[PDB]
Amino acid sequence: TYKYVNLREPSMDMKSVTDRAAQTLLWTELIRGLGMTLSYLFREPATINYPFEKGPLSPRFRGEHALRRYPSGEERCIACKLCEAVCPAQAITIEAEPRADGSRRTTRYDIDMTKCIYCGFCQEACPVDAIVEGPNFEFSTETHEELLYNKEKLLNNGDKWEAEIAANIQADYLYR
Amino acid sequence: HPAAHGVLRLVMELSGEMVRKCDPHIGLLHRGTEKLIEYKTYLQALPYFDRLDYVSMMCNEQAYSLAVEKLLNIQPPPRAQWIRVLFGEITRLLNHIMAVTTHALDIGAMTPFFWMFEEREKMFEFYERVSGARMHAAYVRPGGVHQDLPLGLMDDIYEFSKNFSLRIDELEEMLTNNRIWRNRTVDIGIVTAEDALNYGFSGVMLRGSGIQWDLRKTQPYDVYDQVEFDVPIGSRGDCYDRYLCRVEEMRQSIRIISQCLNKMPPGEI
Amino acid sequence: LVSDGSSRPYRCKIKAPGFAHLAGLDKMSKGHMLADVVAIIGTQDIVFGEVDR
Amino acid sequence: MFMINILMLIIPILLAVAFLTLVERKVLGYMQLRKGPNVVGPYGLLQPIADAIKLFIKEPLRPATSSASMFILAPIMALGLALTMWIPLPMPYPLINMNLGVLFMLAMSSLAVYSILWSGWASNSKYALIGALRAVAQTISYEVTLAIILLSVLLMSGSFTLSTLITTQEQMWLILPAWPLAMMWFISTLAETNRAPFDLTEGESELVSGFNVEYAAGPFALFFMAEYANIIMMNIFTAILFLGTSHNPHMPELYTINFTIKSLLLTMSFLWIRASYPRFRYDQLMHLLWKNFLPLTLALCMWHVSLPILTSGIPPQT
Amino acid sequence: MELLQVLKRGLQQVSGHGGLRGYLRVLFRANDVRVGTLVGEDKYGNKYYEDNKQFFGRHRWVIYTTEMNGKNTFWDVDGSMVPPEWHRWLHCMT
Amino acid sequence: EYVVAKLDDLINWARRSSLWPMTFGLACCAVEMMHMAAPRYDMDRFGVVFRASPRQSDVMIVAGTLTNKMAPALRKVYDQMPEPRYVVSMGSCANGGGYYHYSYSVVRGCDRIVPVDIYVPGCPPTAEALLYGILQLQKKIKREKRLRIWYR
Amino acid sequence: MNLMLALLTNFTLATLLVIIAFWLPQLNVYSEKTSPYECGFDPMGSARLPFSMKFFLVAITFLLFDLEIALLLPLPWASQTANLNTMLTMALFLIILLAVSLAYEWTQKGLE
Amino acid sequence: MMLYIVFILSVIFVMGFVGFSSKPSPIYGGLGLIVSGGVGCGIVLNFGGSFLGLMVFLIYLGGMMVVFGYTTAMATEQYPEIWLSNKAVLGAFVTGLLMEFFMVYYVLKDKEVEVVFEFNGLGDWVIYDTGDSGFFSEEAMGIAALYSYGTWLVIVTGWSLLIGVVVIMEIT
Ligand SMILES: CCCCCCCCCCCCCCCCCC(=O)OC[C@H](COP(=O)(O)OCCN)OC(=O)CCCCCCCCCCCCCCCCC
Ligand SMILES: CCCCCCCCCCCCCCCCCC(=O)OC[C@H](COP(=O)(O)OCCN)OC(=O)CCCCCCCCCCCCCCCCC
Numbered sequence A: 001t002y003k004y005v006n007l008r009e010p011s012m013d014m015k016s017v018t019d020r021a022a023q024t025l026l027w028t029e030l031i032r033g034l035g036m037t038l039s040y041l042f043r044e045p046a047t048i049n050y051p052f053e054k055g056p057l058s059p060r061f062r063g064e065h066a067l068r069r070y071p072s073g074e075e076r077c078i079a080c081k082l083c084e085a086v087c088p089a090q091a092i093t094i095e096a097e098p099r100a101d102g103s104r105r106t107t108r109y110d111i112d113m114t115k116c117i118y119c120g121f122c123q124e125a126c127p128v129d130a131i132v133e134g135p136n137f138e139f140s141t142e143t144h145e146e147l148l149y150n151k152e153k154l155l156n157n158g159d160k161w162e163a164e165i166a167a168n169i170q171a172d173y174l175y176r
Numbered sequence B: 001h002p003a004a005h006g007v008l009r010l011v012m013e014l015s016g017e018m019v020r021k022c023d024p025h026i027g028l029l030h031r032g033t034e035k036l037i038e039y040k041t042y043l044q045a046l047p048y049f050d051r052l053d054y055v056s057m058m059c060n061e062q063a064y065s066l067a068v069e070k071l072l073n074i075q076p077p078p079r080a081q082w083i084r085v086l087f088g089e090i091t092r093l094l095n096h097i098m099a100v101t102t103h104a105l106d107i108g109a110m111t112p113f114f115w116m117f118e119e120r121e122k123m124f125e126f127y128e129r130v131s132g133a134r135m136h137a138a139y140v141r142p143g144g145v146h147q148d149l150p151l152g153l154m155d156d157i158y159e160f161s162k163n164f165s166l167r168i169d170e171l172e173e174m175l176t177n178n179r180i181w182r183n184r185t186v187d188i189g190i191v192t193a194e195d196a197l198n199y200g201f202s203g204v205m206l207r208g209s210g211i212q213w214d215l216r217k218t219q220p221y222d223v224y225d226q227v228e229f230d231v232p233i234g235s236r237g238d239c240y241d242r243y244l245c246r247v248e249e250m251r252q253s254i255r256i257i258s259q260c261l262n263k264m265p266p267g268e269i
Numbered sequence C: 001l002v003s004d005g006s007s008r009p010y011r012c013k014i015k016a017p018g019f020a021h022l023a024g025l026d027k028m029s030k031g032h033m034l035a036d037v038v039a040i041i042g043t044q045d046i047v048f049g050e051v052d053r
Numbered sequence D: 001m002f003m004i005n006i007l008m009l010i011i012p013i014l015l016a017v018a019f020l021t022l023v024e025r026k027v028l029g030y031m032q033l034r035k036g037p038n039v040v041g042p043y044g045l046l047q048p049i050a051d052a053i054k055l056f057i058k059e060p061l062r063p064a065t066s067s068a069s070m071f072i073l074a075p076i077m078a079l080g081l082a083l084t085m086w087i088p089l090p091m092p093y094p095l096i097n098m099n100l101g102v103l104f105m106l107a108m109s110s111l112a113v114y115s116i117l118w119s120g121w122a123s124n125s126k127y128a129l130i131g132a133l134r135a136v137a138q139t140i141s142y143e144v145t146l147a148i149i150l151l152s153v154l155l156m157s158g159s160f161t162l163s164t165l166i167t168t169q170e171q172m173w174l175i176l177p178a179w180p181l182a183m184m185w186f187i188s189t190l191a192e193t194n195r196a197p198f199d200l201t202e203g204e205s206e207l208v209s210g211f212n213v214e215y216a217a218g219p220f221a222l223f224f225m226a227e228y229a230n231i232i233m234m235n236i237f238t239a240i241l242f243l244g245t246s247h248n249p250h251m252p253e254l255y256t257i258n259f260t261i262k263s264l265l266l267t268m269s270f271l272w273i274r275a276s277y278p279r280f281r282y283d284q285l286m287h288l289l290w291k292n293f294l295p296l297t298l299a300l301c302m303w304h305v306s307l308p309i310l311t312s313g314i315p316p317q318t
Numbered sequence E: 001m002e003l004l005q006v007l008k009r010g011l012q013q014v015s016g017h018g019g020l021r022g023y024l025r026v027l028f029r030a031n032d033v034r035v036g037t038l039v040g041e042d043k044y045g046n047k048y049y050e051d052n053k054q055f056f057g058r059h060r061w062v063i064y065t066t067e068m069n070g071k072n073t074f075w076d077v078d079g080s081m082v083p084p085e086w087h088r089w090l091h092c093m094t
Numbered sequence F: 001e002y003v004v005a006k007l008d009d010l011i012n013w014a015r016r017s018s019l020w021p022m023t024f025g026l027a028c029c030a031v032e033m034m035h036m037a038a039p040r041y042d043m044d045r046f047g048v049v050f051r052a053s054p055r056q057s058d059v060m061i062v063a064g065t066l067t068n069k070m071a072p073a074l075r076k077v078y079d080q081m082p083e084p085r086y087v088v089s090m091g092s093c094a095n096g097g098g099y100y101h102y103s104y105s106v107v108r109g110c111d112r113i114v115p116v117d118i119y120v121p122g123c124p125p126t127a128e129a130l131l132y133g134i135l136q137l138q139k140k141i142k143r144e145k146r147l148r149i150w151y152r
Numbered sequence G: 001m002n003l004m005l006a007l008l009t010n011f012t013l014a015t016l017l018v019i020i021a022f023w024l025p026q027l028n029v030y031s032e033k034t035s036p037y038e039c040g041f042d043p044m045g046s047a048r049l050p051f052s053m054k055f056f057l058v059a060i061t062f063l064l065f066d067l068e069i070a071l072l073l074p075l076p077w078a079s080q081t082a083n084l085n086t087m088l089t090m091a092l093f094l095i096i097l098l099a100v101s102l103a104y105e106w107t108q109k110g111l112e
Numbered sequence H: 001m002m003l004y005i006v007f008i009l010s011v012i013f014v015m016g017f018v019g020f021s022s023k024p025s026p027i028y029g030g031l032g033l034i035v036s037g038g039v040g041c042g043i044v045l046n047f048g049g050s051f052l053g054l055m056v057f058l059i060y061l062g063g064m065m066v067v068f069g070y071t072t073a074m075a076t077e078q079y080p081e082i083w084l085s086n087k088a089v090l091g092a093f094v095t096g097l098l099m100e101f102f103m104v105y106y107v108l109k110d111k112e113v114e115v116v117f118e119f120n121g122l123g124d125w126v127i128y129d130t131g132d133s134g135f136f137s138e139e140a141m142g143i144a145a146l147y148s149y150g151t152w153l154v155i156v157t158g159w160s161l162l163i164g165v166v167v168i169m170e171i172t
């Protein structure tokens, strides 16, 4: 359909034009709002007082990585070379080679933490359900020699909290 | 400072006062995109459509995911689309909260920014609860929506919407008829011509200028046809009648979000 | 969106405004001051990285 | 000990101009819905001792391209005519008694803008060059709006001194009778001293940063402490020239007490604006003075001249 | 009228909170000085108060005390210290 | 003797408690900087007042993506800043370039161009791991200007 | 005799405070490279300042309205007289001689 | 703060001039004036005339000069070197400065030398006042406001200014 805005004409009669000459010359407008709508300061401030208080999130949040393990640990990753092949940024790097018993596992697993674009494509391709984006924004170290991760940085970083992780998926896994 | 969340360097030869010349240099953000999307598959290369602009998120990808379902001869199931109207028409509340304000931070005011972004936050939750992340969120796909939304949000959309038409009434008494602003914008940068078409402009700086056309009701998207709305229009081609679309275009949306909470049929995604 | 009949695409050519709404600054503003040209831009809603078009 | 009455003035004021900068963002904080500098204080009241010390540690570069002889005598001012102007200003007892002294402000109100023209020129090219030129041009056209509407009332009080101007406002708060003028006494000092709604001189929007752009932490405390030594003075003036208190030959002290609970309300006006209104685009900025502000100010002068004469009113002075 | 009304909460926010000792000490850590209602058990030295459910987002808060693990004493507080359980509580994820 | 090391509980507490950060808007990451100065998480008034001119700053901040044509601009701006300067990158594109890291027209990494100090990792860092990236930099002044004059 | 004691007191705090700010770290041992990198964000800028007129007149235009409001200044002393009609009839002339001098030029300010 | 605080101003004034009375690169010309004008308005504030002194600040030194300084950006000189620039200004200076000095030296360095410079005595300000008096606004230029007797003096100045603008509305 339509509408027309800013289409109006002044009335042009001496009952009006005072009302527009009691405005220009006496400032009866322009004190209407910012004489007032500004104050209106008397509302409670809204601030999350940071070092202590913190704000909301959701169980589907994304962040620092992990590699779980079952009960008594198997290093849940089977090195099926997938979370590697859907990765848009191509951070992941994986090198398998048959472990002594003959069950296969990894050797090098490196997520670069600069390239990773935080998809949620590597949480959703792993069929054996290993690699999982943690909900901890712990980060920010002082040397780029660092953020590159090896395998045996990840596991700890994913065994430091599994009380966080293992209780999110069981909220979220019923939807997908 | 006047970069508008971006980077440009423009050069003008002004005549002593009047500009009469300008010739900007864009190309500071190029990044090399369309050479890099021949090298990625279809579902792997989606986000580089979300990261294109910073403000509208689910409205991009609504324009990719509709350019793929075609070549596939496939439509989403009914509960797909009626999401893509609720988020699709909730981010028109973002770029219209920004382009009335972070435009008018150049005009120098303070509060119409620090007054609003209290609120543009209460929306960013609703990207985080539905899927994951703060802004860029990859949700729409070639197949309709990714995964269903939690038990909730329909008491956090409704409760939030019925509060909102008031805040948009604190950007009105603070702007429209405030003189020092009316005088900063009227009859300024008027293109009324049929060059304003000849250049092939898109929506607003059209619809606010007279010539009357919109791609929401002349073409269907994804069931967009079944809800009623009116397309505000402007009088004279200056700026302050391209502003006045972007208020009366934030007071149309709350009609649709209010009209689209009643209809969502159960079904797959 | 061209597509060659197999998995990876071929040209995917995006156009967003910013090749129009800023094609028309030089035209639009000739004859007003400099302290307008700051407040002309804001109405087109030019936001960049999009002009990666 | 007359020298210890002076130095008791210059020092105790540099604390206000310091601790204004804090109440700058608390009051302007709650307009935004938030709290003001908080973490460091505990209340914040301890912020400005940490800020005064970051600058003078922080290295004071000079442009290789500057003329150093001017790059000193200019700021070696922005702190004189700000601290001299305070001298003859009754509260209630001014340090000096100047016969005609009211006129002496305009002497020192007129001689500061000749410290802008130096600095912005002293340094270098077009952000402070033609950018410090055209803030000269607006600063001198808001005097003619001034000296007249200062000269108006002085027909309504009899003389040029300030000891009479407490006597005449006795039980009549001199803002009734000329309330049309009083408005223009306000928009002037806000337009002349480069504050919020006509902001252009110091840049944010129209340019990068006006006139401050070159000075690093070293000199730039002075200006940032000079520009706030004018603003709390004209506003510590207006309220001796309009909203009068009632002298008390007995408890002088209750004069100032009730006097800072006015001049300190009044000031909190240039902060209560700055949250609110936008800028003028330098055409509209002067273009609204000749056409609009001025014709009245003459017209009223033809009025306050006759009103005493036409009522047998003529105020008791020479 | 409003001089003694609200004032009766603050004088009980002071004189009934640690007296003078347990007040200036919780203010110098931050200006968070409001005393929540309940308490919490966990864990080492770090409490969790939790407010009465009269706020949203500033209703759930925390307290750091001293030298967690090979740590500087107090005025160093970062916020990666919370035990990896409360991420399921303090962040309002659940 | 001991006066020096007690003096640096002043000067090394002054420079850490007032910062005048420049910012660079370039790319997506700029918006999740704004919301640090919006009232929710309120950047200013926690000691750090927001943007000033290039000359008056201390800590510049790099958001966004740095193409070729922007490098000649940055390295110049980083200079003019006064002494006590730092560089805190943020976002997954100042760390080695997000993606675009294989492109032709993106510099790879923005450590290459300047001596960067603190990092933060992800498309937009969540407006949180920003401030917890600064409460690293206000804790990254434990340094002493003693023991250069006063040892060697 | 105490005015000049209240002036040279004021400058000498100010003319002191330049050196204790500008000069003191100016001889500090930091790097301070001589590179021609200074004069921010208009890197080179080689031109004369061209004559731009509507900058100029707003000088002249004032200077003349200025004079007579020195002539106009001694009204409030002159309100005490013998024959006063020669005042009101005369006083009101200057003003209208000022206001006329507007109305003419007011046909052309240009962009002021 | 002796009786010579007048004689010490003028001989700074007389030296206020010779700065810009030679050839100083006239962005320092101003700084040869606002000192001279300042000390000039200094001398006048003795003798009892006050109002008439404090005006030179308002109408001339404050108001006029700024126009003299608001240009010399329009006529703007070249950035050759300025001031000490060309090696020539310095030569002309001293011989002026000494010429009063060598005057001021033996003008009276002794009892008298000789006649034409000997009829000016010094040091008590012999003339500088007379007796006592009453008060009118002060006595002297306290009454400088005549819209009484002076009229044909104003109405020319009143009318001669009104034409000041018409001439300058044109050639501009
Ligand atoms: C018989 C006795 C005599 C009887 C006389 C009867 C009454 C006459 C007295 C009236 C005189 C009042 C003051 C003079 C009028 C106000 C000044 C004025 O004329 O403003 C005109 C201004 C021009 O605007 P306009 O013509 O519309 O052009 C723009 C179009 N886009 O239009 C405007 O609105 C400009 C508004 C002001 C611009 C700056 C405002 C910035 C905010 C500052 C407000 C704070 C001041 C409040 C006062 C505080 C006092 C303590
Ligand atoms: C950069 C570093 C180098 C510079 C360092 C020195 C800088 C000095 C700058 C001077 C600036 C202030 C000069 C303004 C002069 C104002 C004098 C004045 O107006 O005093 C008013 C008063 C009037 O007398 P009245 O009140 O009518 O009668 C009293 C009867 N008992 O008058 C009196 O009471 C009598 C006057 C007594 C004072 C003696 C004269 C003093 C003025 C000399 C100023 C010399 C000019 C210096 C350079 C000025 C440049 C701006």
Ligand code: SF4
Pocket (backbone or CB within 6 Å): A076, A077, A078, A079, A080, A081, A082, A083, A084, A125, A126, A127, A128, A129, A130, A131
């Ligand atoms: S997690 Fe899934 S994807 Fe990553 S390696 Fe183990 S199996 Fe292959």
Ligand code: SF4
Pocket (backbone or CB within 6 Å): A086, A087, A088, A089, A090, A091, A092, A115, A116, A117, A118, A119, A120, A121, A122, A123
């Ligand atoms: S996180 Fe995002 S980017 Fe890093 S690997 Fe998994 S998908 Fe690829």
Ligand code: SF4
Pocket (backbone or CB within 6 Å): B051, F027, F028, F029, F063, F064, F065, F091, F092, F093, F094, F098, F099, F122, F123, F124
């Ligand atoms: S990564 Fe950070 S910078 Fe690169 S695009 Fe995503 S947001 Fe903008």
